[PDB]
């Protein structure tokens, strides 16, 4: 009934993006296959078509740079982007309209990612308060993670089981490197005592080092 | 293009209220005006298509209405389910073309923001650089004129700042910050300030950490 892509992601400059979206459920040779993506703070963007016959339509702004194919015996429909540039990163969907009625089923997504940087892995340093009043009975900890690429990354505390008001943020580019923060708020008296270990997890690197937390003596 | 002006980009609102969301097409669109649900992670939920017709299993609440340019999208009670991205498209003319969005937030009204003033570390500082960090975790509204300043200064060079989605169970936002620091930029002023300008306390409410007290 649905439809499923391909990788790879994350390429440089000048490289092309090779989508492929695989269906189920319809005949490639009774319905067109759409191609959209969504940039980050934008609305959706159409790229292309291609039609039941394989007539093909495409975006007049990406017209000299974009190619869509497909084989329906194989029911595989294939994408192409021909020289990528920065702003070309989004989600890139595959959809298909019904009859009848506007688009209603959509691929999974193709996060993609244009830039020519190393995977770096991030490092983590740990936060605890700098003394003054201590009143109120609750105070919120830090665990600041610096520098990393690509993306995504699990920032969990005490091994992904205190989570009450744990608030990790969307990270910010700083020149091909990556920042972001986490917080959690816990009572005054038992941490002091019972601390909390701070740790991370990043998939395409594979770091997962451990820190727990200690003030400073004022 | 046909360009797909839609309006408003945020509306607030209580369970229970009635709700119009506008869409201006740049040319006639006969009646291809279709309207989807956005929740994150999830994939588009098509909703009303050809401005009025109600996809297949969608509650009557849902609503709209338009022909030609002018499109409307009804919700006459909202609920948990409906809190989430909305958009209208047009499949007119190719290329087909989408709204900008309208995010739905939900009031709860008024709320003070715990703001947790933060220094670095000597386990921060091990390859010669550091970083001032500032939480201020549930506030409402996302109206905050806040600053990392200098003994009452506006010179923001590395500040670096985040927001996040209004979390669905306790319905208030979170704000974190980062006023990044060399090693001799680090010894300059002795104090600064993570700032807040909410109307909880109208007299406006500093939190400072000084590096002597």
């Known amino acids: 009934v649905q439809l499923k892509q391909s990788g790879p992601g994350l390429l440089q400059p000048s490289q092309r993006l090779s989508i492929t979206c695989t269906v189920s459920g319809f005949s490639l040779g009774r319905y067109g296959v759409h191609w959209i993506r969504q940039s980050p703070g934008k609305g959706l963007e159409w790229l292309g078509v291609i039609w039941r016959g394989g007539t093909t339509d495409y975006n007049a702004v990406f017209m000299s740079r974009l190619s869509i194919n497909k084989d329906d015996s194989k029911s595989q429909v294939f994408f192409t982007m021909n020289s990528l540039r920065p702003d070309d990163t989004a989600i890139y969907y595959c959809?298909?309209?019904?009859?009848?009625?506007?688009?209603?089923?959509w691929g999974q997504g193709t996060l993609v990612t244009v830039s020519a940087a190393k995977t770096t892995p991030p490092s983590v340093y740990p936060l605890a308060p700098g003394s003054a009043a201590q009143t109120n009975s609750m105070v919120t900890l830090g665990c600041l993670v610096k520098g990393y690429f690509p993306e995504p990354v699990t920032v969990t505390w005490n091994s992904g089981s205190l989570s009450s008001g744990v608030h990790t943020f969307p990270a910010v580019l700083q020149s091909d490197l990556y920042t972001l923060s986490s917080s959690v708020t816990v009572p005054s008296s038992t941490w002091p005592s019972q601390t909390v270990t701070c740790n991370v997890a990043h998939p395409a690197s594979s770091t997962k080092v451990d820190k727990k937390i200690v003030p400073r003596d004022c | 293009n046909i360009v797909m002006t839609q309006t408003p980009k945020f509306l607030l609102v209580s369970i229970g209220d009635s709700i119009t969301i506008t869409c201006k097409a740049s040319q006639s669109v006969t009646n291809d005006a279709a309207w989807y649900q956005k929740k994150p992670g999830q994939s588009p939920q098509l909703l009303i298509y050809q401005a009025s017709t109600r996809y297949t299993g969608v509650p009557d609440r849902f609503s709209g209405s338009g022909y030609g340019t002018d499109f409307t999208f009804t919700i006459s009670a909202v609920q948990a389910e409906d809190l989430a991205v909305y958009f209208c498209?047009?499949?007119?003319?190719?290329?087909?073309?989408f709204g900008a969005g309208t995010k739905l937030e939900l009031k709860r009204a008024d709320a003070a923001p715990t703001v947790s003033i933060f220094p670095p570390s000597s386990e921060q500082l091990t390859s010669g650089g550091a970083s001032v960090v500032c939480f201020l975790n549930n506030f409402y509204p996302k109206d905050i004129n806040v600053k990392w300043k200098i003994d009452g200064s506006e010179r923001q060079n590395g500040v670096l700042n985040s927001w996040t989605d209004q979390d669905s169970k306790d319905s208030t936002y979170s704000m974190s910050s980062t006023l990044t620091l060399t090693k001799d930029e680090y010894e300059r002023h002795n104090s600064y300030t993570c700032e807040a300008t909410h109307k909880t306390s109208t007299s406006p409410i500093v939190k400072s950490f000084n590096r002597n007290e």
């Open positions: 959809a298909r309209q019904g009859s009848n009625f506007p688009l209603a089923y």
């Open positions: 498209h047009q499949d007119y003319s190719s290329p087909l073309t």
